[PDB]
Structure formats: structure tokens, C-alpha cells
Amino acid sequence: GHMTIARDIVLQESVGKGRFGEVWRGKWRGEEVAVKIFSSREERSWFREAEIFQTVMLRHENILGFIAADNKDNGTWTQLWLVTDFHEHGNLFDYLNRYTVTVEGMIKLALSTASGLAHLHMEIVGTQGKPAIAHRDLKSKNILVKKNGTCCICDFGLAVRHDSATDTIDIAPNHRVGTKRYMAPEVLDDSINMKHFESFKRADIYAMGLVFWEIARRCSIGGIHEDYQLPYYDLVPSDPSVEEMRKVVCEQKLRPNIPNRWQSCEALRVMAKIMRECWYANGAARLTALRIKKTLSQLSQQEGIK
Template identity: 40%
Template sequence: ISDFPTVAVKIFPCEEYSSWKNESQIFTDASLKHDSVLQFLTAEDRGSGPRREYWLITAYHSRGNLKDYLSSHVLSWMDLQKMAGSLVNGVAHLHSDYTACGRPKIPIAHRDIKSTNVLVKNEQECVLCDFGIAIRLDPSLTVDDFANSGQVGTARYMAPEVLESRVNLEDLESFKQMDVYSMALVLWEMASRCEVVGEVKNYELPFGSKVQEQPCVDTMRDIVLHGRGRPEIPSSWLPFHPQGMRFLCDTITECWDHDPEARLTAHCVAERFNLMAQMDCDDILNNNTDNEM
């Protein structure tokens, strides 16, 4: 990266060629371009033989990933609203059948949404990155094509149906529902570091106190699938921002519902963030009116 002060170079060794190829193909789809998706510049292969390397060159964001950022920063309500909203907008764009300009596009499921796969663009914006196991939800693909993709993702963030290996491969919406579950865990991480919850505790990953740093699928299956466990949303979070924070917590809860079909869509969550922004505008207007009186 030192040779490219404004770009990042992600290097894949030979044995990770398939991941590089998949991510390159996802990135080279022009319809992927979005403010909340990492900006792709080019893909290259370097060298030959066993020393051959595969490069992805993207925009560079010096603030690093969301996990590290949350570890050392407490968010204001506005920061939380903006940063979380940008993440949600990115996921909604991936899942959409259309670009912002209205052009048809193939929806994409990320399949590994987690706080280390979200980069902090600035104090109020995030971008999604790492599309190594993302999949294009092309209607022309068969159930066998999707079945061959296997059980993928990071165990800590896997939805119950993924942990159980009971994903409905005949319904492409299933892949989006998995993303929404994972996204809910990241939203919880962000909410847990917001100053409006009162005493902000040290940053913790979802299920942090219950599992090891890299829990296995069996461990997460016991907690999430059989125990129906989810990260705690303390009652103390809710009174501090009666409209916005409660609305956000309700949204998170609906996104990690055990039943995939009961979860909100990313588009619905994006609409809710717009409503939260409107709530804040109304609060400001009402407060100003009260002060004038």
C-alpha cells in the first residue's frame, strides 16, 4: 500500500485464485457501483508459477474496518444513524433488481457480512467490502448451482438456517434473508457503542462473552439454533432516545428473527432509517418551537 498512497492492494496467493476470480467478477459488474460499496479500480495477476499472485486494487480507507473503529470510538446518535444507514443502503443496493438510476441489475448476496467486512469511509459513512464468497442471484442458475456453493460465511454471523444447512435454495430470497440476519448483528455492534445508551461498555463482538474469538459452527448452532440466543438488547438502551433508539432496536430484532421469511428486507430497513431521520427532524422542529414559546 505504501507504493499507492490512495489505493489498497489486496493480494491473493495461488491457492486462493477462486476467491480472487469470484470477487473480481462481482466487482467488474458496473451495476455494483454505489457510495456504500468499496470502490473497485482494477484486478491484475502478477508473476508466474508458484509465485504467481492475484491482485485486487481498490480505494483505500485509512480508518480501517468497522470492528477496529468501534473498538476505539464511541458514536453519537447522529453518527450511528448515518453510519448504520449507509451500511443498510449498501446491502439494499446489493439485493436490488435495479440500480439507483433504474437500470435492471442482477441482485447479489454478500454471504459474509460482518464488522471486519465493513470499512469506515468517514465519520458518517461505511462501505461494504470482501466479495470473495458473494453470489449473483441470477434466475438462470439452477438449484444445483446454488447447492454447490456450500455452507459459507463466518460462524459467528451465520443465520440459523445456514447453521442447520436448511436453506431453501429454490427461493433466491433465502440468500438475501441470510444477509439481513448478519447485518442485524453488525447493527447491534454499532448500537452498543452509541452514547445514547447511557454507560457505553467496551466494544464486544456479537455473542462475545459466550464464545471464543473464532467460534465453530457447532458452538454457534447450540447458541443460535437450539438455544435461540441473540445478543442482548438491554432495557436500559431504550429510554434514552425514546423514538429513534427503540425504533432501531425493534428493527434489529425483526432482522434477526428465527424465521427467515419473517425478517425485514434490506429495502424495508433502509426505509425505516429514512423514517428515523424524519423523527429527528421533527424532534428538532418541536424543540425549537417549544423554546420560542
Template identity: 40%
Template sequence: SLIVKAISRLGPVARTGGVRGPHGVRSEGAFLSPLLALLLLLLLNWLHPHPKALKCYKTDSEASNLTLEGCSPDKISCVLHFRIDKSTGARHRGLSNCWNLNDKCGIADCLYTPHSRIEDHGSCCCRTDGCNLMENLRLVTSPPTATTMPSKGGSSQGNRNSTSKSSSNDSGSEGGLFAKGGSDQAASVLLFSLAPVLAICVTVVLGFFLYTRHRERRKSRSESVGLASYPVDNHPFPVGHLSSHIRLKERLATGKFGCVYIGEDAETDQRVAVKVFPPQERGSWLVEQELYSLPEMSHPNILCFIGADQCGQGPDLRLWLVTEYHPLGSAHDYLAGHTVSWIQLLDLAESLSRGLAFLHESSSEKPAIAHRDIKSRNVLIRSDLSCCIADLGLAKKFFQGESIGDVHPQVGTRRYMSPEVLEGAMSFYKDSFLRVDVYSLGLVLWEMLTRCTDAYGAEGVPAYRLPFEAETGSSNPSLSQMQAAVVIERRRPEFPAECQSHQGLSYLRETICCCWDHVPEARLTAACVAERCKALRRLPVSVAAEEARRRQQEEQLADQQAPAVDLQLPQAAVINEASAAASAEELRPLREAEDAV
């Protein structure tokens, strides 16, 4: 009841319920009013700090012994009763004690106001430790006030009545808001004692309120992101009006986040790729839109972003992401139907590595980006047989100095998950996410290598297979199958036998093995892989030619009869030795380039 009484004196601020909004919901004032009341209490506590216990001289009932003792919290002044000798006017000390009133009391001086009706005794009061002594007695000649000092022989009831009267009439007393009587003083003391607890509560509640408001505003901004927030230079269609210019034609693919269509501009007949997201995948749509629109995001080996749009309303809402269209399709589709030469293999490998290295790099404007779903289906083949990386729906950007935040580590395609992702032992650092991408890069490079004609002999290139399809015996392995093969057995896809004898393929095989190393810290960076592929470009023509000539000579020798074969063996050995020497000489610049990297 004391707390309620004290808060009620704070005025209507503590009782205000706030202003109702247009929908009948209380606005922020409803939440802030109690906070303002608590803050006002803290301010009052600062202006009126909790006083220390006052010490006054006290006497026994006979006024014989005088001792300095502490007062109770509700006693805020010292009182001295004295007797006046009418004949001589001398004053003699009487009872001394603590008192619960400070109106018209002195500070160090014990002030006494003579009363016309009381001539033989008087009282004075003061407010400092040990001030109620006869030597501190001072006479006040101002007119009498409604406040009466307690008399030596007066009853306790009379004292209480005079105290109550003084408290109620003197609104300008020094006690302030909480110093108007014993009950008010008790409320003040209680509130001052609760001030630290109230301060902690205010801090926690206010912090939670600000955090909640911050999250709501961020969510509101992200959900109301207009397409004009992501200006894209040099795109052929006005941002925000793409759906009125583009007609959807053939469906190309269906994925986890949506469908990809061939789109055609109604005026220019230019073809584009349109990725259509359902409303529930709005988060992925916003992520891709934001990443594609980052400053300095343009790169020849990253899919070119044209714009984004919303089509329809309500349950029919569709979210568009418009990019360049590449007729050759994904690396998965292209490799399944085509083989590649050694030169084409290097084109694919280097361009893919450079695209991933660009994502991983950071600059003053562009953050480092981990793709988190590198696979052959998310790599598109351009008309010049170079690669560009697509599908940034699971990507994570890393701004310098910012925390990683809430990120689920086990995302992506199971077949391409690294050992640390499969067993849930991934470290939450930027480099850890980038190394996961490099592991997946190694598997895609393996897919490309296994479709190279130089990697096989006369039997020809076998049918296209996905990574771990032979090791797990499944075209869609489960998580437990991948954990058993990759984490427990530490298996990796097998290379063609010809990679051992082909100098260039052997070196590329070594690079791939460094990409999918079981220890994340031992893996190469994407930039290093790109430099290795670039260094291999100096060798492929001569090395491949020598390998082809060697295979042709071996086939010719095998077709001859046994005696003839015996006679030709020394010559074949000489040819092979010369070929190996030439290959070693050709690889010397490559080894020097590797040392430089």
C-alpha cells in the same frame, strides 16, 4: 462377426483414428469417427427400414395343398415352379415357397424368363404378399442373365451356388449394401434390430461429449480472462498494468483469501488498497473481479473498484485487486476504538442498509447479489462516517431465469451465520440467500448500537464486544457453540438497558430484532431497514435532548438530601411526563413512515 463385417463396409470413416494434435494427442476426429459410423448406420436404417415378414403361398411336397404362410427374415421373395406341356404350351402349377433372392424378381407380377436349355418347366419370383400364383405369371423376353431360377428338381447345393454367383456378380441389384446373400441379409437384419440401442448410445455419448466440451471451454475462458474483459470506467490506472504503477507499502490486514496492503501510485502518490491473492485463491479473485465489474455496479455504499492485475509468474504469482483506500478502516476496527452519537449511529446504519439493499436489487443489467459474509470486518468506514460494503469473494449472483447451480450453503463467518445456515436447513432459493444477509446485517447494527453514547447512562459506554461473545464466552466460538446458542437456545445478543427508555433506540432495537428473527420469512428486507433508519432521522435531536435532560435532572435529584428529594419528586414526575409526551409527539411521523414502508 456379422456386426464387424457390416461396419467394415462403411469405409474408412469408421476406422479413422483422427488427426493427432501438436502434442501427439488425438483431436476431436478420433472421438467423432465412431460416432459418425453409428450415425451412418442409423441413416441406413432410415433408408432401408426393417422389412416386415413376407407372406408367400406354400405347397407340400405333392404340390396339392396351397397355403399362405409367413416367411423367415432371410427370405425376401416368393417363388413359383410350374410345368410346361410341350404339346399344348399350357403351364401347370408346381411347388411354391419362399426364396432368399430378389434379383430380377417382379413386385406384384411373378416374372418368368424362358431358358433355351430348359423346355419342360420354369420358375418365377415376386416380392409382395401372396404374389406367387399362376394368374400373376408374366413372361419376360429379355436375354438370359447369369441369374438362374431354382429348378423343381434341382439340388439345394445348385440353388445356393447360383444364388452366390448372382449375388457376387450383380453389384447393381436392388438389395443394396446389405442384400447380397443370406449372410449379408442376416447382418442387415441384426443391425436394423440394434438400431434403437445404437441411437440411445449415440445420444448419451454425444450429449456427454458436448457437455464435457462446454465445461472445458467455460473453464478455459474463465482461467484466461484478461483484465481487458472487465473494463472499469474512471479508474486512475491503466487496467493490466497496475503492478508497474503501484508500490506496496504497509500491510493492513490478513484474511482467509489473502492480504490487504496500502498501495501508492509512484507518480501521483495517491493511496489505494491492494488485496493480494495467492495463486490457489484465483477463483475468489475472479469472482470479486467479475462482480465489481458488472454493469450498474457503482454505488456510494459499495467499495469502489479500480482494477486488477497479475504480478509475477509460477509459484511467485500474485493476483491483485485494487480498490479505494479508506483510512478509518473497517467497522470492527473503528467501533473498537471509537464511540458514536445517535446521529452518527443513524449515518452508519442507513448507509450500510442501503449498500446491502443495492446488492440485493436486480435490474435489466445487474443481477441480484447475495454477499454471504456480512460482518463488521467486511464493512469499511468512509471519511464522512458512512459505510461501504467490501469483500465479495463469497458472493453469489442471481440472474433471472438461471438456476442457482452448485452452491455450498454453509459459508461465511460462524459468528454471523443465521440459524438455518448453522443447522444446514437452508432453502436453495434466491430469497433464502438474501435473508441470510439480513440476519448478519442485524448483528452488525447491534455492534453499532452498543457503541452509541445515548444508549448508556452515567456509567459510560462499555468496552467493545463482538456478537455472541458474552453468550458463548468465547471470542472465537466453534460451530457447535454457535449451534447451541443460536439454534437450540435461540439466544441473541443483549441490548443496553437504556434502549427501553430512549424512543429512538427502542425503535432501532425493534428493527434489529426483526432482522435476526429465527424465522427467515419474518425478517425485514435491507431496503425496509434503510427506510426505517431514514425515518428515524426526523426525531433524534429532540428525543436525545429530552433524554439527556431527563437523566441530568435525575442525577441532580439523587445528589440532594432525602426530604428535598421527596419535595422534588412530584416536579420530576411532571418533567418526565412532559418529556414522554414530547417524545410521543415526535414519534408520530415515524410511525406514519413505518406504516408507509
């Protein structure tokens, strides 16, 4: 047939894991594809991520390209597959550990992440309407770097969708899901109002601010940059508990430190200001993803990027 299906894909190499499922590099008609495999007992996680990926009008240059949700029976058990575009550079966490970026590179990565999130967060009204979506697990490990230097967001297993007319969320979400290190203050202290969709959007913003801090450290100007670090590397253990995170973020009220050299460059000054404005303990005070996109677009034009 013309459509991509599991039976026509050959797995070649293990390339990591998501929250649920294992990721493999596959081959479909000579072309590289990413394949996320789930067992029968993980049917709900598989189904939920396939459901998010198939949302009407979701496709966007800054959202991971969905190919197919399929089943493959090997004759003993059935694997549940989620097929997507393959990106050679892998995730932003891996890329930032391997490389430093230029001012252009940094702005390209930050702007494309902000454009992807604003598309996700924004409702598109009309006959082929797209509901507003909150990611709930944004981190550098869930952002993939494309060959052209732009980003796309992936891993939608925890995402929530909003029905604006009836003001309802498509699933009943559980407290403190996601990556503990990137959890917003209101998530860590359980004060988040989970019956208000805007709360999930604001929590994604906080996490995006942390990712921007990760990028900016790697922005090398005149061969000077910081080494790669995860946010809160200087304050919490490698695998921090919610209690360790809450004591730092909510009680001591600390945020990742803004290095003095970021004050000496306009692009880094703009990035530093966006970060602070993502990091308020109160979500209603944080910038929106659309405002961040607008700010970074203006900065991209000023520096003549791409």
C-alpha cells in the same frame, strides 16, 4: 496510460487480510489505494471477487469502490491483485473498538450499511441491468468506515448473483460458508433452501441485525455506553465452532441482549426493534434491506442528521 494498473503501484504497509488474500496499502501516482494480493493457487477466489466487483451497475456510495483486477510478475512468481479505494479508518470492527459514536454517528453507520445491502440485494432491470446479489459473509470486519462517517461493504469472495428470468444462481454454493458467529439459524442447522436466492438475502439480513447491535452498544448519550463486544461474546468461546453456535442460536434460541438503556432513546428504540425483526429463526419473517433503509431514512430525517 490513464487507467490504474499494478505495475504503477508501490506497496507500503500490510493492513490485514480477507477470507482469501492479504491486504496492503499501496501508492498510485501519490494516491493511497488498497491492494489485495492472492497467490497463483488462489486464482479462483481472486477471479470470483474480481467478477463480483465488475458486475454492471454495482457502484454505489455504500459499496467499496473497485479500481482494478490485475497480475504482477516479479520475475519469479505472479501475484494476482485486486485494487480498491483505501479507507484510513479501516473496518467497522476496528472503528467500534476505538471509538464511541453519537446518535447521528450511529444512524449514519446503520443507514449507509442498510443502503449498501439494499443496493446489493436489489435487481436493476434494463439494458445495463444489475442482477440481485447476496453477500454471504456480512460482519463488522467486512464493512469499511469512510472519512465522512458513512460505511461501505467489502469482501465479495462468497457473494452469489441471481438470474431472475431463469430463476438460477450463478454458482453452486457449499453449505456453511462464512463466519460461524454471524451464520443465520437456517445456515447453522443446514435447513437453508440453497436453490432459493431469497434464502441468501434473508441470511444477510440476520447478520446485518448482529452488526446493528455492535453499533448501538457504542452509541454514547450523556457519556454512557456499553463497551465493544462481538455478538454472542457472553455465550460462546472467542473462535466458536458451528455446533457451539447452533446450540445457542437454534436450540436455546438466544440472541444478543438488548440493554435497558436503549429503551430511553427513540433512535435506540428504532434500532432495537429493527434488530429483533432481523433475528427471527425463520428467514421469511425477517425485514428486507429496503424496508430497513426506509425506516432508518425516516429516523434520519426526524433527528436532522448529516
